[PDB]
Amino acid sequence: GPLGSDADKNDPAGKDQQVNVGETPKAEDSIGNLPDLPKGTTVAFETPVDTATPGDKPAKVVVTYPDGSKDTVDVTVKVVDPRTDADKNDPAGKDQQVNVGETPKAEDSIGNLPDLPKGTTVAFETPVDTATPGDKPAKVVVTYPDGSKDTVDVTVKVVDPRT
């Protein structure tokens, strides 16, 4: 019947690429075997890739051959945030007051817990000594959901209730 099309002859290969938040990915970087394909073959994303948020993005690369025939390739574009949760957040430390013998909670030594990501945890680097009154220096370790950590310097004021 007719002589075959360029798409009838070739099969383009999908390739996963990695980019940063705000970076625009190139279709060429999503195709492995571009030299196996004919000279003059162009590659483009069917849908311009969204890189405003991190995460694995689904994409379609349209392969237009010199004769006009086209092939569609399904790929994944890995979008990553170069800035960690520790870069994206600033914990507001609070100096807390307790009585002699009371155990202080690290939660009560950080005032902006909801401003921090969901799943973030707070603990004292070293347990606070409350056996005697006075201003006890402490460090609250803020462990973010991405694994990153911030460290806040606070004061635990220990008071004698019979004074």
Residue numbers in the entry: 225 to 387
Task: Show the paper's wording.
The interdomain linker is short and consists of the residues DPRT. The similarity of the Tm of RibR and Rib2R is consistent with the lack of a large stabilizing interdomain interface. Importantly, both particles display very similar RgC values (8.7 Å, RibR; 8.5 Å, Rib2R), suggesting that Rib2R forms an elongated molecule represented by 2 RibR molecules stacked end-on-end. To further assess the interdomain orientation, we performed molecular dynamics (MD) simulations of fully solvated Rib2R at room temperature (303 K). The rmsd from the crystal structure fluctuates by up to 10 Å while that of the individual domains varies by ∼2 Å, showing that the mutual arrangement of the domains fluctuates in time around the crystal structure. Remarkably, the 2-domain structure remains extended on average, with an end-to-end distance of 96.2 ± 9.5 Å, which is consistent with both the Dmax calculated from SAXS (97 Å) and the length of the crystal structure (98 Å). Modeling of the 3 interdomain rotation angles suggests that, while a wide range of long axis (x) rotations (α) are accommodated, rotations around the y and z axes (β, γ) occupy a more narrow distribution. Given the lack of interdomain stabilization in Rib2R, rigidity in the interdomain linker is likely to be influential in maintaining the interdomain interface.
Proteins attached to the surface of group A and group B streptococcal human pathogens that contain tandemly arrayed Rib domains have been associated with invasive infections and proposed as potential vaccine candidates. Here, we study Rib domains from Rib, R28, and from a surface protein from Lactobacillus acidophilus. Together, these 5 structures of homologous Rib domains, and further sequence analyses, show Rib is an example of domain atrophy, a rare event in domain structural evolution involving the loss of core secondary structure elements, and also reveal the remarkable structural malleability of this domain family. The structure, molecular dynamics simulations, and small angle X-ray scattering of a Rib domain pair suggest tandemly arrayed domains are likely to form an elongated rod on the bacterial cell surface, thus suggesting a possible mechanism of immune evasion mediated through domain number variation.
